[PDB]
Paper text:
Among the multiple subunits of PSII, D1 is the most important one because it binds most of the active components of the electron transfer chain and also because it undergoes rapid light-induced turn over to protect PSII from photodamage.
The hydrogen bond distance between D1-E130 and the 131-keto group of PheoD1 in both PsbA2 and [name] strains was shorter than that between D1-Q130 and PheoD1 in PsbA1 by 0.16 to 0.17 Å. In [name]-PSII, a hydrogen bond between D1-Ser270 and a sulfoquinovosyl-diacylglycerol molecule near QB disappeared due to the change of D1-Ser270 in PsbA1 and PsbA2 to D1-Ala270. This may result in an easier exchange of bound QB with free plastoquinone, hence an enhancement of oxygen evolution in [name]-PSII due to its high QB exchange efficiency.
Residue numbers in the entry:
A (entry chain T): 1 to 30
B (entry chain A): 11 to 344
C (entry chain E): 4 to 83
D (entry chain F): 12 to 45
E (entry chain V): 1 to 137
F (entry chain D): 12 to 352
G (entry chain C): 24 to 473
The structure:
């Protein structure tokens, strides 16, 4: 149960990295 | 163009979402190999005989660790500095017992971050930038190289490289202090000045720029909306900031030149980290911190202890306890 | 730009050095004598090299009593 | 032209005067033998 | 505390005669001990054989007795095992083996007396710390 | 008109060293804290409080001098010069450790004065007082470490002593007795300090390597004017570089500089909370599940159990000299030691 | 002139960059700097000699230059004993005198002679962009370096030999008569792994290979120098490199950095061209010598050191390497690749030989192991010898530690300097080393990433 919890949180962070890079708000010059 | 030139154009393209480049051609596979092996080992690797005395240390989550205690454990002292790839083992089971994952990971990782450094040079060149961000990044690279490669070489074993884990990092620090008195070494003291000062100057610079943001928003808006990405006008009043900081101390202690200021912000932590990396890399050859043990002596010859002698008592406690089954002879010579 | 005389003016003037060729060495020598006469030991209560221990006892004269601590250092010092 | 005794003058000497006295004291200490 | 004539008075021979060393002799002995001996005997222990130390009580039970000037000076000329049974000049620095322990080549008779005096005086200053090892650091 | 407004005028004159109302608190307290430290490290012993030499006069060097804490028997006495311990005797006061509370307390009020100075000058110049707000982190550290920690312990004796090696001893004490590296509040402190140093380096390097060519010199510092309207470096190019190198990049300069305050200030505040816990010995010392397993299974070993053995060595080998009021005599047969060493 | 920022474009703290296109003054800077190097070699040697006590080991006296002279066979005899200090004196004086000549020429070219050389001499003048002139000067210097490598050969073969720690019967000066010429051996060193038990070129363990290697290097450098005098860079080279003064400097900085790290490892592990008689034992050596010391002591007391099981189950004195060889136990199991003349008589085909250990250990071996165990390269920055918890008493830091640490520090900063100047030379050749053109910012002409 503890191992599942640690790996789950880690996996969410890796997923977050993916969205934060490839699905970021695009920088736009105004 | 021919197919090779098309490939070169893609590799060196400024329009890839992540820059590849020739350094990236080495960086990407090596960082992937190191990352994948590390994640699998941290979760599932069996215990590793780090000190070569058939006393395996459990590092992985499934073998009883949490995030704080877990590690990928350095390779066996019986291996020393020998190169121990998977194909030198008779089996994966042997490879795992002897700490094979540690070597695969640190060697791919070090190649990867050296190439990450070259890649920072490379993109700056493709974008028409000045080139020296990679020189700033050379400080963390030097520090990682010191603890994963130079220190093991000097001591004769990757079993004395820093473990890949949170508590294993602390173990490395405590034993290092016992064996080198790093706290009393001026290069580590410069390192501390580097990171305390870097944190101080980050907070100082952050607070001074934030203090002088030009009013562009109402009180119900984040002030951050007062800056638009790519606008040409500066977003804070550096004359106001200097007028504040120069009065906080005195006028000539404050930067009025933003280029000088930002050079100082780069140089202070980078130089401090260079020196602390050199501290580890030279204590790797046992040139150790200052030794004032018994330096103060009274008229008869009695030692008068100083705080250095109290430090020595703490170092002794770590010395005599560390690797409690590994020493058979009276001196710890590596 | 706050109205005081620039330091570079001051420390390159002969008048500054006429004054400070006297005052800086006088202060330095006074500090030297504060030590060489032994006065520093007595002002601050710092043991001289022969005064940390008596000849037979090899125990630290540690203060153990808060409100008669002053008198206790007096006793430890009379034991030398 | 310029004033000579200022707040700055006081701040300079509150630091500089003891510093020189202390350096003379510490120089003397280098010749103390046990 | 002070380095007094009483502290500097040590047994000269095994018959109870004493000798009073000068402060110069003591300082000479400490210097020569560091020059020729401390690489193995720092603080009164023995790095290459920790079972044998330089405490006065240990020296007194050596054969022949080494807890006096004559015994120590003789040891530096013709060292023996603790029971006196074997001569060990081939593996221990001595005047007899100055050819293979070259730091002994310029030690005079006066130098040996000073080293011996240092070995006997130092536990009178340091107590159990002399020969105690790291426990006493 | 009015003596208060006339005094306010003089305090706020634009001069080489600004004074202000805050200066009435700051300058005497800062001068006395620094002067006390220089006085103690130059001339004052720790023989009667610690059994230690601690001054240049006794033979220490810059790394080993200190103004050391009072003896444990003093408890948390303010140790005022005119108080019941020293009774006005300056010499005895120094021997009792009175300079430690002198420095700690004048230092505390000087830090108050300094943060008031940051507020006062910001108000006079017309800027927002974020520099003062950021300085709350140094204050949180000073108060938690030099005042709250010893106040939770038996006496000022266990506060840090004001010296280089004395502070190193404090670090190793916290390792051996508190297992302070294991504490998640210290870990957040480390992330904020190293993260702040990282931000300092990377931002300074990024600005210096995305500069616009605003002059002809190969040395580029002269090509900046403090009064110029234009950014001196390209945020757009900097943003593309880091986006392609690292995957993300700043796009908002105001957020960037706020973040540079946030990270180290927050880290120091977190480390202070952990130290408040250690004032009560409320440590992150153990993982209970680790201990239950290790107690039942003598083949189970982790880096966590390895570090506790080091801690046990620290306590047994350092306590007799580090805690002289306890009169510890540990016969050498009881000292924990591995094989041979 | 141009000796200000306004005319030269460089601030005072980058003032030597004002010399990039002033070949006469730059020659002066280089010649004067060579005088500084030679000055130090001479003065430091005389200082070492003035402080030298011939009956203490060199490594007890903080010497790094006298050991270099002694390794060449000058001043020493069997076992490394100093028989004559006059060669040390000669080396020191002649370097010191020579540095006056170099300093004279450097000062002359730097402030008195022609500021540029091209108007004065087409032979000595040069343009950094003239690729053929660049390879010609490179070629002259390759020939000079090749001659230098052959001077070592001539010393070893015709002018008294070299100090050989491996000489049969004990270390001694020995004339090398059969240097190794077989390229399979010489260049085989180049293809050895740098990892444990292999050690790349740092593993060279006999003077025949050392001398033969310098014969090859001497001829390679002379032949390469002739080649570069007679050729101009090929097209593929022209297209691959930056051709500028700062670029060439950056290439040499990378090279010197690499060489510095190599010398660090050489002095740390190698005991052939850094004899332990002069430099002290290596780290591996002293750790092995401790195990040897207590094996000898306990066996004298009656221990059967082959059958003695240590606390872990491994042999207390003797165990197996991962490939089966008999090696010393305890922590020094990591150091089983160590080889030294005091230990090899005990080694047989299967490793350390128990019968030789029981019967054949000589007093000179016990002495050497005791000496090396107690001169391990551990010590403090203020030169307190021993482990970090040692008390003050012994004034010792091994020459190997001084030489390894100094050259790691220098090699490191030279790698940083390589990155600095390589990055700058690239940017300067492409025309943006002074910053981004506001009216021609490259990223503004690129498609957005998203
Ligand atoms: C072109 C660009 C660069 C290309 C790089 C190519 C890939 C290589 C990367 C280098 C990393 C090598 C890892 C192992 C290095 C090592 O274990 O090196 C050790 C070896 C020596 O190995 C030892 O060599 C010994 C040789 O001694 C033997 O022989 C002797 C003969 O007298 C003695 O008898 C001795 O007792 C006996 O054991 C033994 O074999 C040992 O077992 C063996 O470990 O050194 C050597 O090969 C010399 C080489 C040392 C290089 C060190 C590089 C450090 C870089 C630092 C960067 C800092 C951070 C910068 C940030 C930016
Ligand atoms: C603003 C500057 C400042 C501040 C905040 C402090 C603060 C302190 N000093 Mg330091 N000191 C200072 C300047 C300062 N000092 C200077 C300039 C000197 C050199 C002369 C010293 C020399 C010094 C020494 C030698 C010592 C201290 C000590 C102390 C501590 C105890 C002080 C105390 O109890 O006073 C109590 C007195 C007051 C608080 C004065 C209050 C006056 C009240 C408000 C007036 C009351 C009037 C009443 C309301 C009227 C009613 C009228 C009505 C009935 C009609 C405290 C931390 C002691 C220490 O640090 O021990 C460890 C100590 O030994 N100070
Ligand atoms: C063969 C080696 C070599 C050569 C010929 C050059 C040449 C040059 N360098 Mg490079 N550099 C080198 C190695 C070299 N460098 C290394 C190893 C580093 C890493 C630190 C650098 C980092 C570097 C930077 C960051 C810069 C240069 C620059 C330059 C140019 C101007 C230099 C100048 O005027 O300095 C003047 C000298 C000083 C201001 C003094 C420096 C003092 C050092 C830092 C401390 C020395 C302490 C000493 C070793 C020990 C203490 C002694 C003390 C007690 C007295 C010039 C072309 C500049 C440039 O880019 O021009 C285009 C420039 O900005 N260099
Ligand atoms: C090895 C170190 C070294 C060397 C060899 C040089 C050499 C040179 N520098 Mg550089 N420089 C250095 C370090 C060095 N520098 C450092 C550390 C800094 C930062 C402080 C600089 C900053 C700098 C700047 C800003 C400039 C130079 C310039 C020069 C050149 C002209 C100097 C001149 O006009 O002197 C004028 C000075 C004198 C006439 C006074 C006397 C100088 C002599 C040489 C002293 C000789 C003393 C010696 C003991 C005599 C021995 C005599 C005996 C052999 C008979 C010259 C080639 C200049 C240049 O590039 O010109 C184009 C220039 O503008 N340098
Ligand atoms: C390869 C370089 C090197 C090495 C390995 C040695 C090694 C040694 N020296 Mg020699 N020496 C050298 C160069 C070297 N020296 C130079 C350049 C000088 C002229 C100053 C001397 C003059 C000298 C004297 C007069 C003596 C020695 C002595 C010694 C011995 C004791 C050293 C010691 O205690 O240092 C103390 C440690 C330090 C001083 C720490 C230095 C830290 C440096 C300055 C940091 C440098 C960082 C980097 C270079 C700058 C980068 C800046 C960055 C921002 C870019 C040791 C064998 C002693 C001896 O035993 O003689 C027999 C002795 O008396 N040396
Ligand atoms: C290697 C560095 C070097 C280089 C490339 C030069 C180059 C030059 N020099 Mg300088 N010079 C140097 C070092 C150097 N010099 C030194 C060390 C000194 C002090 C003696 C001088 C003192 C000096 C003076 C006073 C003058 C020059 C002049 C010249 C110019 C004409 C040279 C000529 O026609 O010689 C012709 C060639 C020969 C005579 C044959 C070579 C004879 C040498 C000595 C044989 C040694 C060779 C051997 C490889 C050296 C090994 C040295 C090594 C161990 C360090 C030429 C640009 C002249 C000039 O500037 O005119 C305007 C001029 O008047 N030089
Ligand atoms: C100071 C020494 C030196 C320098 C700076 C040069 C410089 C040059 N040489 Mg010359 N050369 C030299 C000595 C030198 N040479 C010697 C001694 C010889 C006789 C053997 C030669 C024979 C020679 C020939 C036949 C040629 C050159 C050529 C060149 C030019 C291109 C070089 C190049 O691309 O290398 C870069 C190296 C490569 C691109 C090869 C691949 C390198 C791999 C990828 C990495 C190797 C690094 C590795 C980690 C090293 C350590 C391990 C290893 C030892 C096992 C360049 C001007 C070329 C030219 O244009 O001539 C006119 C050419 O054809 N040289
Ligand atoms: C300090 C860090 C180092 C900064 C480097 C110095 C600038 C180096 C620099 O740029 O030089 C330039 C600067 C100005 O020199 P000038 O000759 O032009 O002086 C003109 C001015 O004095 C006229 O207003 O020199 C100084 O400021 C030296 C001041 C030393 C300090 C003396 C006064 C100290 C009093 C105490 C200050 C307390 C501050 C209160 C805060 C709580
Ligand atoms: C406590 C007290 C008090 C006060 C006092 C005071 C206020 C003092 C001051 C004092 C002082 C005010 C002192 C000073 C000193 C100083 C010094 C002692 C200095 C030194 C310096 C040096 C040594 C330097 C060094 C260096 C550096 C830092 C860096 C650069 C380089 C060099 C190395 C140079 C009173 C009476 C109120 C009361 C009672 C108590
Ligand atoms: C350019 C320049 C520079 C530099 C310069 C230089 C670097 C120079 C060098 C110089 C040099 C490098 C010099 C040298 C000299 C030497 C000499 C002058 C010597 C002499 C010797 C003798 C006299 C000897 C004697 C003796 C004998 C014979 C025997 C034994 C004893 C004795 C030792 C006594 C500078 C930085 C300033 C800057 C500006 C520019
Ligand atoms: C003396 C001796 C010896 C021998 C030695 C030898 C024989 C050596 C050789 C050596 C060699 C023979 C070396 C080589 C090296 C090479 C190199 C170091 C290269 C480099 C390269 C580079 C740097 C490149 C770069 C690049 C790339 C990669 C691509 C892109 C473009 C470029 C081109 C930039 C022995 C050990 C036997 C023994 C001891 C003594
Ligand atoms: O493995 Mn990790 O730690 Ca460097 O010292 Mn020796 O070896 Mn072990 O004991 Mn202490
Ligand atoms: Cl451990
Ligand atoms: Cl061992
Ligand atoms: Fe900024």
């Amino acid at each position: 149960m503890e191992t599942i919890t640690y790996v789950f949180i880690f996996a969410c962070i890796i997923a977050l990295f993916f969205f934060a890079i490839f699905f970021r708000e695009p920088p736009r010059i105004t | 163009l021919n197919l090779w030139e098309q490939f070169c154009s893609w590799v060196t393209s400024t329009n890839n979402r992540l820059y590849v480049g020739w350094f990236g051609v080495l960086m990407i596979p090596t960082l992937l190999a190191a990352t994948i092996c590390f994640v699998i080992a941290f979760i599932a690797a069996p215990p590793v005989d780090i000190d070569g005395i058939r006393e395996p240390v459990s590092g992985s989550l499934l073998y009883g660790n949490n995030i704080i205690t877990g590690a990928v454990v350095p390779s066996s002292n019986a291996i020393g500095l020998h190169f121990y790839p998977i194909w030198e083992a008779a089996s994966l089971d042997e490879w795992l017992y002897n700490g094979g994952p540690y070597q695969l990971i640190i060697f791919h990782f070090l190649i990867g971050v050296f190439c990450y450094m070259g890649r920072e040079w490379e993109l700056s060149y493709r974008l028409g930038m000045r080139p020296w961000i990679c020189v700033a990044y050379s400080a963390p690279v030097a520090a990682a190289t010191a603890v994963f490669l130079i220190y093991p070489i000097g001591q004769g074993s990757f079993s004395d490289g820093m473990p890949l884990g949170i508590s294993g990092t602390f173990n490395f620090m405590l034993v290092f202090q016992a064996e080198h008195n790093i706290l009393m070494h001026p290069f580590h003291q410069l390192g501390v000045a580097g990171v305390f000062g870097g944190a101080l100057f980050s907070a100082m610079h952050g607070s001074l720029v934030t203090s002088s943001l030009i009013r562009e928003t109402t009180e119900t808006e984040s002030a951050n909306y007062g800056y638009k990405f790519g606008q040409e006008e500066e977003t804070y009043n550096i004359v106001a900031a200097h007028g504040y900081f120069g009065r906080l101390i005195f006028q000539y202690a404050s930067f009025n030149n933003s280029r000088a200021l930002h050079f100082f912000l780069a140089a202070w932590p980078v130089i401090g980290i260079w020196f602390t990396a050199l501290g580890i890399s030279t204590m790797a050859f046992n040139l150790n911190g200052f030794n004032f043990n018994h330096s103060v002596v009274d008229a008869q010859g009695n030692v008068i202890n100083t705080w250095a002698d109290i430090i020595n008592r703490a170092n002794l406690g770590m010395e005599v306890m560390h690797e409690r089954n590994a020493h058979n002879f009276p001196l710890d010579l590596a | 730009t706050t109205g005081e005389r620039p330091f570079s003016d001051i420390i390159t003037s002969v008048r500054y050095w006429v004054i400070h060729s006297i005052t800086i060495p006088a202060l330095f020598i006074a500090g030297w004598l504060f030590v060489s006469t032994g006065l520093a030991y007595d002002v601050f209560g710092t043991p001289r090299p022969d005064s940390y221990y008596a000849q037979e006892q090899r125990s630290i004269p540690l203060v153990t009593d808060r409100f008669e601590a002053k008198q206790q250092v007096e006793t430890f010092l009379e034991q030398l | 032209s310029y004033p000579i005794f200022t707040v700055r003058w006081v701040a300079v000497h509150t630091l500089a005067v003891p510093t020189i006295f202390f350096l003379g004291a510490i120089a003397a200490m280098q010749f103390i033998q046990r | 505390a002070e380095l007094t004539p009483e502290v500097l008075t040590v047994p000269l021979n095994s018959e109870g005669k004493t000798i009073t060393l000068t402060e110069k002799q003591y300082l000479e002995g400490k210097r020569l001990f560091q020059y020729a001996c401390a690489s193995c005997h720092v603080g009164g222990i023995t790095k290459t054989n920790p079972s044998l130390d330089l405490r006065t009580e240990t020296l007194a039970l050596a054969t022949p007795p080494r807890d006096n000037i004559e015994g120590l000076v003789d040891y530096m000329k013709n060292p023996t095992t603790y029971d006196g049974e074997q001569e060990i000049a081939e593996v221990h620095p001595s005047l007899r083996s100055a050819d293979i322990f070259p730091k002994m080549r310029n030690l005079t008779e006066k130098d040996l007396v000073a080293i011996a005096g240092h070995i006997l005086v130092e536990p009178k200053i340091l107590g159990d710390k002399w020969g105690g090892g790291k426990v006493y650091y | 008109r009015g003596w208060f407004d006339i005094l306010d005028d003089w305090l706020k004159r634009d001069r080489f060293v600004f004074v202000g109302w805050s200066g009435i608190l700051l300058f005497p307290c800062a001068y006395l804290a620094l002067g006390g430290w220089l006085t103690g490290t130059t001339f004052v012993t720790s023989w009667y409080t610690h059994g230690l030499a601690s001054s240049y006069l006794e033979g220490c060097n810059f790394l080993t001098v200190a103004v050391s804490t009072p003896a444990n028997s003093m408890g948390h006495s303010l140790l005022l010069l005119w108080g019941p311990e020293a009774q006005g005797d300056f010499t005895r006061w120094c021997q009792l450790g009175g300079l430690w509370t002198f420095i700690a307390l004048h230092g505390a009020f000087g830090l108050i004065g300094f943060m008031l100075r940051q507020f006062e000058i910001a108000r006079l110049v017309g800027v927002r007082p974020y520099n003062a707000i950021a300085f709350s982190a140094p204050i949180a550290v000073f108060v938690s470490v030099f005042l709250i920690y010893p106040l939770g312990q038996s006496s000022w004796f266990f506060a840090p002593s004001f010296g280089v090696a004395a502070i190193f001893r404090f670090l190793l004490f916290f390792q051996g007795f508190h297992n302070w590296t294991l504490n998640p509040f210290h870990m957040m402190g480390v992330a904020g300090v190293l993260g702040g140093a990282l931000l300092c380096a990377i931002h300074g390097a990024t600005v210096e390597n995305t500069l616009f060519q605003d002059g002809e010199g190969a040395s580029t510092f002269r090509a900046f004017n403090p009064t110029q309207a234009e950014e001196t470096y390209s945020m757009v190019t900097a943003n593309r570089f880091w986006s392609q190198i690292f995957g993300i990049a700043f796009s908002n300069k105001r957020w960037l500089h706020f973040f540079m305050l946030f990270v180290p200030v927050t880290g120091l505040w977190m480390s202070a909370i952990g130290v408040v816990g250690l004032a009560l010995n409320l440590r992150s010392y153990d993982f209970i599940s680790q201990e239950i397993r290790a107690a039942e299974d003598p083949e189970f070993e982790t880096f966590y159990t390895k570090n506790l053995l080091l801690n046990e060595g620290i306590r047994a080998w350092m306590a007799p000299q580090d805690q002289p009021h306890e009169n510890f005599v540990f016969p050498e047969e009881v000292l924990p030691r591995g094989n041979a060493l | 002139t141009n000796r200000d920022q306004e005319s030269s474009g460089f601030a005072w703290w980058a003032g030597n960059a004002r010399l990039i296109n002033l070949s006469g003054k730059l020659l002066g800077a280089h010649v004067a700097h060579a005088g500084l190097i030679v000055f130090w070699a001479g003065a430091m040697t005389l200082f070492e000699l003035a402080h030298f006590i011939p009956e203490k080991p060199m490594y007890e006296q903080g010497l790094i230059l006298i050991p270099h002279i002694a390794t060449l066979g000058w001043g020493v005899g069997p076992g490394g004993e100093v028989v004559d200090t006059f060669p040390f004196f000669v080396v020191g004086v002649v370097h010191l005198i020579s540095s006056a000549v170099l300093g004279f020429g450097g000062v002359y070219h730097a402030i008195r002679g022609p500021e540029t050389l091209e108007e004065y001499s087409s032979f000595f003048g040069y343009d950094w962009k003239d690729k053929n002139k660049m390879t010609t000067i490179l070629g002259f210097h390759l020939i000079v370096l090749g001659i230098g490598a052959l001077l070592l050969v001539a010393k070893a073969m015709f002018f008294g030999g070299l100090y050989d720690t491996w000489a049969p019967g004990g270390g001694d000066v020995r004339v090398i008569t059969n240097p190794t010429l077989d390229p399979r051996v010489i260049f085989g060193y180049l293809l050895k792994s740098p990892f444990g038990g292999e050690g790349w070129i740092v593993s060279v363990n006999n003077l025949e290979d050392v001398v033969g290697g310098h014969i090859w290097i001497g001829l390679i450098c002379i032949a390469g120098g002739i080649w570069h005098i007679l050729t101009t860079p090929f097209g593929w080279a022209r297209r691959a490199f930056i051709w500028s003064g700062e670029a060439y400097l950056s290439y040499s900085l990378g090279a010197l950095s690499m060489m510095g790290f190599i010398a660090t490892c050489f002095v740390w592990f190698n005991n052939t061209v850094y004899p332990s008689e002069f430099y002290g034992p290596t780290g591996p050596e002293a750790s092995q010598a401790q195990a040897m010391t207590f094996l000898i002591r306990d066996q004298k007391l009656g221990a059967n050191v082959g059958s003695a099981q240590g606390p872990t189950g491994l042999g207390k004195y003797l165990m197996r390497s991962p490939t089966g060889e008999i090696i010393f136990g305890g922590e020094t199991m990591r150091f089983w690749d160590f080889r030294g003349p005091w230990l090899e008589p005990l080694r047989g085909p299967n490793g350390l030989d128990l019968n030789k250990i029981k019967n054949d250990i000589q007093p000179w071996q016990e002495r050497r192991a005791a000496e090396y165990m107690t001169h391990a390269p551990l010590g403090s920055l203020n030169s307190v010898g021993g482990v970090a918890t040692e008390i003050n008493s012994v004034n010792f830091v091994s020459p190997r530690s001084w030489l390894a640490t100094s050259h790691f520090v220098l090699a490191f900063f030279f790698l940083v300097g390589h990155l600095w100047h390589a990055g700058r030379a690239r940017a300067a050749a492409a025309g943006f080393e002074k910053g981004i053109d506001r009216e021609s910012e490259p990223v503004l002409s690129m498609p957005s990433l998203d």
